[PDB]
């Protein structure tokens, strides 16, 4: 869909940027639920 910015506190015991805000980049994927419409089955064969 696109991307955007995010702000959050950082939990990372060790970093000079621990417990401090970090602006970060993120991507939003559109995910309206999927409909199941079939089932297919697979076997082991000595050639695939």
């Amino acid at each position: 869909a696109g991307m955007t910015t995010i702000v959050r506190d950082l939990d990372r015991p060790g970093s000079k940027f621990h417990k401090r805000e970090v602006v970060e980049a993120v991507t939003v994927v559109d995910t309206p639920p999927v409909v199941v419409v079939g089932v297919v089955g697979y076997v082991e064969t000595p050639r695939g």
Binding site: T5, V7, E21, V23
Partner: protein, 98 residues
């Protein structure tokens, strides 16, 4: 999470947005965008650039109902009296005359 404003333009600077400029006198300048930040470098006067926050404030533009009051008074009036003389003797004996 502060939201500084453009020292020139005037609008808000949500996190990570625009640039920041530390001058030699160690004074900080934030710009929402390249536009102001250039018009800043270009020695332009904020009070001359019409859309700027500083322009409208100096030229008395769009204020309307802030151009009126509100409501912020109260009530008090009691008697804590003078201290060290029985504070009850100062409400009673205050019988007045006129």
């Amino acid at each position: 999470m502060k939201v500084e404003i453009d020292s020139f333009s005037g609008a808000k600077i949500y996190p990570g947005r625009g640039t920041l400029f530390v001058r030699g006198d160690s004074k900080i300048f934030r710009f929402q965008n390249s536009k102001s930040a250039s018009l800043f470098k270009q020695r332009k006067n904020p009070r001359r650039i019409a859309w700027t926050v500083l322009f409208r404030k100096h030229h008395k533009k769009g204020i309307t109902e802030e151009v009126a009051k509100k409501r912020s008074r109260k009530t008090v009036k009691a008697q804590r009296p003078i201290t060290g003389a029985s504070l009850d003797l100062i409400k009673e004996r205050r019988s007045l005359k006129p």
